Design an enzyme around this catalytic site. Structure first.
Site, mmCIF file in Angstrom:
data_model
loop_
_atom_site.group_PDB
_atom_site.id
_atom_site.type_symbol
_atom_site.label_atom_id
_atom_site.label_comp_id
_atom_site.label_asym_id
_atom_site.label_seq_id
_atom_site.Cartn_x
_atom_site.Cartn_y
_atom_site.Cartn_z
ATOM 1 N N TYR A 1 0.838 -1.189 0.000
ATOM 2 C CA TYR A 1 0.000 0.000 0.000
ATOM 3 C C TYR A 1 0.876 1.243 0.000
ATOM 4 C CZ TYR A 1 0.897 1.588 4.759
ATOM 5 O OH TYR A 1 1.487 2.089 5.897
ATOM 6 N N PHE B 1 2.385 10.877 2.464
ATOM 7 C CA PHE B 1 2.845 10.713 3.834
ATOM 8 C C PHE B 1 3.279 9.297 4.185
ATOM 9 C CE2 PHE B 1 -0.249 8.559 6.700
ATOM 10 C CZ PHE B 1 -1.104 8.103 5.718
ATOM 11 N N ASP B 2 2.973 8.298 3.358
ATOM 12 C CA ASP B 2 3.376 6.930 3.649
ATOM 13 C C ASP B 2 3.431 6.135 2.352
ATOM 14 O OD1 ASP B 2 3.029 3.961 4.506
ATOM 15 O OD2 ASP B 2 3.405 4.994 6.404
ATOM 16 N N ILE C 1 -6.032 0.289 12.412
ATOM 17 C CA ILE C 1 -7.209 1.102 12.138
ATOM 18 C C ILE C 1 -8.155 0.365 11.186
ATOM 19 C CG2 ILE C 1 -6.091 2.338 10.226
ATOM 20 C CD1 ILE C 1 -7.574 4.888 11.580
ATOM 21 N N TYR D 1 -8.237 8.713 12.130
ATOM 22 C CA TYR D 1 -7.861 9.119 13.482
ATOM 23 C C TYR D 1 -8.859 10.117 14.061
ATOM 24 C CZ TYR D 1 -3.458 7.082 11.874
ATOM 25 O OH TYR D 1 -2.499 6.241 11.359
ATOM 26 N N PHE E 1 -5.887 5.807 0.090
ATOM 27 C CA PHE E 1 -4.917 4.723 0.023
ATOM 28 C C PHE E 1 -4.981 4.034 -1.332
ATOM 29 C CE2 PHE E 1 -3.323 4.502 4.344
ATOM 30 C CZ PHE E 1 -4.301 5.158 5.063
#
Lengths: 564, 107, 434, 241
Positions: free
Chosen positions: B26, B36-37, B56, B82, B99
């Site tokens: 992912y 960010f990821d 999550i 979050y 995502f």
């Protein structure tokens, strides 16, 4: 270069490339421009596309007024070409709340301000309104079609005819309101931001509203930029779009294999680059720039220094948070790049060290002066010399068998919970990192052997000091094994020390040799403690042919070896 | 509510049940073009677990309708994200997330 | 005494005298000119330190330091100048910067004397509530952290928020990050009284945070058949073309892959790699008001423009795609795998000159299908449309225009191409004479 | 230039000749442990390294919980009493003492009123000196500074006594030689504090005012307890003290 003319250059990549050089240059003995350099020479070209990041500095030309300020750029002459303006905004805006960064009950709007241009003169009935992020066009006559009338339509296939206000939401600014305000009293384009950006934002100058809808989804809000005609009425002042920006093109293009048989085109070699990431989250202009933008170079170097200072002397989750902003491939590419400015190279190296090489290296350096050794059968299998030929051998090779602290890392995840025990937030592929470090050590040694005029970045100290620092920090953690250490040793044994080096560079192999001496001391103490067990056993055995005891607890090891 | 837009045709014959190992690739993607990821750059596939709140629930909601060898776009709301506080240092409060989670193997 | 605006004028202010006094004070307290030799440099440092300790014992009980803090009355910009005298707000920067920086070096002193201003909460709050010159606070914070880190405890969440607001308002000072990093270890000396508290306070969600991107590099392709069909004296209106994909390879380095076959707005957009604050894009279909093609959605500067078609999928291997073009009544649409795509897209930048455009990233081989000698057409043009192979000029073999740019992958020879926008120097919209 | 460079060069040059000096420096530092106790030695070393990450940096608020946990972990180890010379080699009493230094400071503020290190310094290290009883001498070496910093407060029962005085008491608890080596100039400070304690009692339970604890106060008996340990020995009294 003029229109429809082609030129060529040869800076001196090869002597044979220069055509008419033997006549004068070789006989006199003058070297070419780029004979000392060993890297591809880049160039800069004037940008045909005009840029939109300029402010007027040396161009050719209570509540008295709500916003209450002034500027000094008033036009006099030598301009009639409907110039496009931009001025910086460090000032506040009215007093209806603050909305922090520059539900309004019992109020109409907020941020009451204006980029004032005197509209009462009406030199050519100027158009006034907001624009989007891209208005890269310098056509004199405009508003004929507003560049485009972009409107995406998609229905069942109808419905959903979403319209876009292309390059500008600029209103007509025509005669418009028939009020015809005396003197320069036609609104002065006062701005009033609405609480919601989904529907519409109000930016008008007319005394009565006629039409400014241009329904678009939320796009941007930025520094004020509006249009104005050019005559001599002294119209504009805060209550340019110059195209003089040289642009570096590139060093290595993407290779294409376009050919015949159906005009097939294929690509197999990938290429990547980064972009600027200045704070407040709005900038992206190339990466290999900033070698000519001193202010931004200083600002980004100080930002990197702030990152290194914040993630220092151990930190639980700030390192994890910074790993999202700065990922592994960006760091690896910055390390690998041979054209990076020296300040940025040093900053990225120090950031890499401070987030990934900090905690475990500090712990190992703390424990390096303890010399704790266990008692196992493998500890006895070590000697002062590996062979009877009295050869000293390499220092770092050989077993150690010392109780050194263990290495424990974690994973960043960022979709998971409860992760604060760390060495680095991810784990680097340390094998290929070591391979890259060794290959760069060899490349730097070879480059410094020829004593180039152009080092990798800035100068030789910027080339070497971060690289040697990274190598030393990796070496003081025991990642190296036998063959890697053997390969490393012949880079210094015959030579890195032989060549002339500056003082910041010279400070580092002193620490390297200090670590080598520490390793030799550890080898000595391991050999001593290995022989100690054999000697103590032999002494205990010899304490059995002259034994003596008169205590009730006979055969106590106090007789063998114990005081009490 | 979850909106999944497939970009690769999954088989759909198999579904991820409760209690079998799975490997996942992912790349996180914050809105307005913010990254960010990611996992491809790290070259370390993300391995996680369905059904006991170790992660999550947006990933469960995305992967419930997916299958083996399928890549799709994931959209999640702040409540399933979050939410009111976010992760201090990366994610601002009251922010959605996007995502590109992909499934490789189910065992 | 004379600053107070009582006892109406025929009262004087010795502004010139106090300005000369401040100038002579900065001359007296000037740093010891480190270019000098070690011995006299240390003698000058010792003499300055003695004067500093002397002013220390004289000052921070009820004297010069708090006296200057009292003198800091100028809560105005020009109103005080207009009311009392003619100028009352000009030399404040000089006295503030000079005296406060030197009194901070004074508080540094002989590593023992940091009596009042190093921990005076009220005077600190006064300093953080003004935000004009940060040299004094940077100096005192750095010196206290070096000697005995006790001033860093006073700085708290409100002060951090105020300095962050200063950074937000005043654009990129690059002297504020200096003090923010001085609120940390700052090369070795460190005390966890407030160190990690400030470290965790400096990074909440998106207040002082950055990113960075490693973007794939792409370039666009186009054939040498340049249409440029204008309006008015109409010549042709219907054109058709199709393309083939063979060896698509997702995530050759990273998950981002590039494959565009649709067109975009080339007005103000060139094959140049990019440039600008917001993302202008590296390929075609990359502008904010651009479409290109992706097979899933016609993105316009990262804006949701989803399009629904049967069996939604990416442009995988062995996939067919066609396009239809209109000028009088634009009917730009696509056809993939024998089915028309929905989302009737009309009124983009449609005026002037058009040409086929395609762009992609590494890991892709693409076959062209135009017509005639090479157009082994799997699909035929729709009604009205004719496949685009008639614009080729006589005795001029067709080729690839390469989206005409400066250089390619060449080793030996160089090429400094001249400024020429198209085949014509400046002429556009070609029509026959009438 | 850059005298750090020349210092490094001359240190490196001198090290080659004084390799024997390096050896004689490292020899007291080294240790040797059973190959069956590695699994606890490494845990003790990890906890001690976690504590020793807090010596260049200082004490705060969120760090005292972790540091108390580390002190408990290094307490609850078999090796902690099985190999008494290891801590003297490692300097943990020194590290805990720098922790106490930066907690206390020159003045009296008591920002962190958690003397969880005082038990570790006083009881345990002084108690397990069975073989090579240098722990008592090492604690003897700093009781002048301890007496100077003898701050008010005894938090283990939560009285306002003086818990750092218990460190000197445990250091001079038993050994005849240490109490004999104790000399006059360290004795008068205790009686100066005792004389300063000579004030009348007016309020109900305070030291100066504003009563908070209402169990029982202690005026000055801890100083006399320290002197009681000073004036006696294992089985006989001492003449000079």
């Amino acid at each position: 270069l003029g229109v429809a003319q082609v030129g060529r250059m040869n800076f001196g990549k090869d002597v044979s490339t220069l055509k008419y050089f033997t006549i004068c240059g070789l006989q006199e003995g003058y070297e070419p421009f780029a004979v000392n350099t060993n890297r591809d020479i880049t160039m800069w070209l004037s940008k045909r596309l005009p840029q939109f990041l300029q402010v007027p500095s040396n161009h050719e030309h209570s509540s008295p007024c709500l916003k209450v300020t002034q500027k000094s750029f008033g036009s006099q002459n030598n301009n009639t070409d409907i110039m496009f303006y931009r001025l910086s905004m460090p000032i506040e805006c009215a007093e209806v709340f603050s909305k922090s960064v520059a539900e309004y009950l019992m109020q109409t709007s907020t941020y009451y301000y204006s980029v004032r241009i005197f509209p009462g003169q009406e030199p050519a009935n100027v158009w006034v309104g907001w624009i989007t992020s891209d208005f890269h066009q310098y056509d004199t006559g405009f508003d004929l079609d507003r560049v485009r009338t972009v409107t995406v339509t998609l229905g069942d296939e109808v419905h959903e005819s979403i319209k876009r206000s292309n390059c500008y939401m600029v209103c007509a600014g025509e005669s418009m309101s028939p009020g015809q305000g005396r003197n320069n009293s036609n609104g002065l384009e006062i701005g009033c931001v609405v609480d919601a950006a989904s529907g519409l934002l109000t930016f008008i100058a007319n005394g009565k509203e006629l039409s400014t809808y241009y329904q678009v989804e939320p796009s941007t809000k930025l520094f004020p930029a509006v249009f104005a005609q050019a005559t001599s009425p002294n119209v504009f002042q805060f209550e340019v779009l110059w195209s003089r920006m040289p642009n570096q093109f590139l060093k290595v293009d993407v290779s294409r294999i376009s050919e015949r048989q159906g005009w097939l085109v294929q690509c197999l070699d990938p290429l990547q680059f980064m972009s600027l990431h200045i704070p407040e989250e709005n900038r992206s202009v190339d990466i290999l720039e900033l070698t000519e933008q001193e202010e931004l170079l200083q600002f980004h170097y100080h930002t990197l220094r702030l990152y290194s200072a914040v993630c220092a002397l151990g930190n639980h989750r700030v390192a994890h948070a910074l790993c999202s902003h700065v990922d592994e491939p960006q760091l690896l590419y910055a390390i690998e790049n041979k054209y990076m400015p020296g300040l940025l190279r040093a900053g990225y190296y120090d950031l890499l060290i401070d987030i990934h090489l900090s905690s475990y290296a500090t712990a190992r350096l703390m424990m390096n002066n303890e010399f704790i050794v266990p008692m196992t059968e493998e500890t006895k299998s070590i000697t002062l010399f590996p062979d009877e030929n009295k050869k000293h051998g390499l220092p770092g090779i050989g077993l150690s068998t010392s109780l050194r602290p263990r290495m424990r890392f974690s994973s960043p995840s960022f979709v998971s919970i409860s992760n604060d025990c760390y060495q680095y937030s991810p784990e680097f592929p340390l094998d290929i990192l070591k391979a890259k470090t060794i290959q760069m050590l060899t490349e730097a040694v070879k480059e410094g052997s020829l004593h180039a005029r152009d080092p990798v970045g800035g100068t030789t100290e910027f080339l070497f000091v971060p690289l040697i620092k990274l190598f030393y920090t990796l070496l003081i953690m025991g990642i190296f094994h036998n063959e890697d250490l053997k390969h490393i040793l012949q880079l210094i044994e015959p030579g890195l020390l032989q060549m002339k080096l500056p003082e910041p560079v010279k400070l580092q192999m002193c620490l390297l040799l200090q670590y080598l001496c520490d390793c030799q001391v550890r080898h000595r103490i391991e050999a001593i403690v290995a022989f100690s067990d054999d000697f103590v056993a032999k002494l205990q055995d010899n304490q059995r042919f002259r034994y003596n005891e008169v205590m009730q607890a006979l055969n106590m090891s106090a007789a063998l070896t114990a005081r009490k | 509510g979850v909106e999944i837009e497939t970009i690769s045709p999954g088989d759909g014959r198999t579904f991820p049940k409760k209690g079998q190992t799975c490997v996942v690739h992912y790349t996180g993607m914050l809105q307005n073009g913010k990254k960010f990821d990611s996992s491809r750059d790290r070259n370390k596939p993300f391995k996680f677990r369905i059904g006991k709140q170790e992660v999550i629930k947006g990933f469960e909601e995305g992967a419930a309708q997916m299958s083996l060898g399928q890549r799709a776009k994931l959209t999640c709301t702040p409540d399933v994200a979050y939410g009111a506080t976010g992760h201090p240092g990366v994610i601002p409060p009251n922010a959605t997330l996007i995502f590109d989670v992909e499934l490789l193997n189910l065992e | 005494a004379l600053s107070k605006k009582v006892k109406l004028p025929t009262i004087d202010l010795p502004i010139e005298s106090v300005s000369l006094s401040l100038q002579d004070l900065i001359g007296y307290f000037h740093p010891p000119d480190e270019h000098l030799e070690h011995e006299d440099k240390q003698n000058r440092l010792r003499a300055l330190k003695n004067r500093q300790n002397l002013f220390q014992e004289e000052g921070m009980i009820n004297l010069v330091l708090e006296c200057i803090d009292r003198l800091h009355v100028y809560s105005s910009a020009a109103h005080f100048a207009d009311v009392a005298g003619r100028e009352a707000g000009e030399s404040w920067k000089s006295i503030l910067n000079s005296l406060y920086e030197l009194l901070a070096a004074l508080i540094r002193g002989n590593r023992k004397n940091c009596a009042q201003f190093s921990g005076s909460l009220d005077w600190l709050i006064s300093r953080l509530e003004r935000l004009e010159a940060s040299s004094g606070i940077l100096e005192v914070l750095h010196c206290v952290l070096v000697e005995s880190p006790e001033a860093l405890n006073i700085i708290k969440e409100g002060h951090i928020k105020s300095i962050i607001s200063l950074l937000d308002k005043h654009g990129r000072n690059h002297k504020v990050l200096d003090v923010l990093c001085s609120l940390c270890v700052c090369h070795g000396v460190a005390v966890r009284s407030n160190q990690h508290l400030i470290c965790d306070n400096l990074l909440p969600g998106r207040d002082l945070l950055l990113q960075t991107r490693l973007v794939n590099h792409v370039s666009s392709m186009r054939p040498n058949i340049f249409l440029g069909v204008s309006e008015g004296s109409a010549q042709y209106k219907k054109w058709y073309y199709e393309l083939m994909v063979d060896h698509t390879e997702p995530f050759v380095t990273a998950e981002a892959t590039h494959l565009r076959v649709g067109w975009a707005s080339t007005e103000g957009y060139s094959p140049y790699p990019g440039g600008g604050e917001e993302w202008g894009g590296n390929g075609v279909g990359d502008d904010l008001f651009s479409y290109g093609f992706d097979g899933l959605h016609l993105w316009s500067g990262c804006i949701a423009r989803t399009v629904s078609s049967p069996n939604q999928h990416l442009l995988r291997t062995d996939d067919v795609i066609s396009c239809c073009l209109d000028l009088s009544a634009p009917s730009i649409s696509f056809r993939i795998n024998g089915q028309p795509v929905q989302g009737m897209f009309e009124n983009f930048n449609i005026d002037g000159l058009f040409f086929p455009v395609v762009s992609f990233s590494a890991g892709i081989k693409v076959r062209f299908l135009l017509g005639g000698r090479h157009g082994e057409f799997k699909f035929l043009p729709p009604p009205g449309y004719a496949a685009c192979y008639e614009a080729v000029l006589p005795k001029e073999k067709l080729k690839v225009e390469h989206s005409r740019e400066y250089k390619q992958e060449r080793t030996y020879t160089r090429d400094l191409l001249g400024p020429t926008v198209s085949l014509t120097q400046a002429a556009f919209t070609p029509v026959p004479v009438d | 230039e850059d005298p750090e460079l020349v210092r490094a060069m001359f240190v490196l040059l001198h090290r080659q000749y004084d390799g024997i000096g390096g050896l004689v420096r490292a020899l007291p530092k080294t240790y040797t442990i059973n190959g069956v106790s590695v699994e606890d030695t490494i845990n003790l070393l990890a906890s001690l390294g976690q504590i020793r990450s807090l010596l260049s940096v200082r004490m705060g608020k969120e760090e005292e919980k972790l540091m108390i946990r580390g002190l408990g972990d290094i307490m609850n180890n078999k090796v902690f009493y099985q190999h008494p010379n290891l801590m003297r080699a490692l300097g943990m009493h020194e590290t805990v003492m720098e922790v106490m230094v930066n907690v206390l400071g020159g003045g009296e503020s008591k920002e962190i009123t958690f003397p969880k290190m005082v038990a570790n310094c006083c009881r345990f290290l002084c108690y397990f000196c069975r073989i090579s009883r240098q722990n008592q001498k090492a604690m003897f070496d700093h009781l002048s500074y301890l007496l100077e910093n003898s701050s008010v407060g005894l938090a283990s029962p939560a009285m306002r006594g003086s818990t750092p005085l218990d460190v000197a008491a445990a250091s001079v608890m038993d050994n005849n030689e240490l109490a004999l080596a104790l000399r006059e100039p360290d004795l008068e400070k205790v009686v100066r504090y005792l004389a300063g304690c000579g004030l009348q009692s007016c309020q109900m339970l305070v030291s100066k005012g504003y009563p908070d604890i209402g169990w029982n106060p202690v005026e000055g008996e801890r100083y006399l307890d320290f002197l009681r340990f000073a004036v006696f020995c294992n089985g006989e009294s001492v003449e000079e003290n």
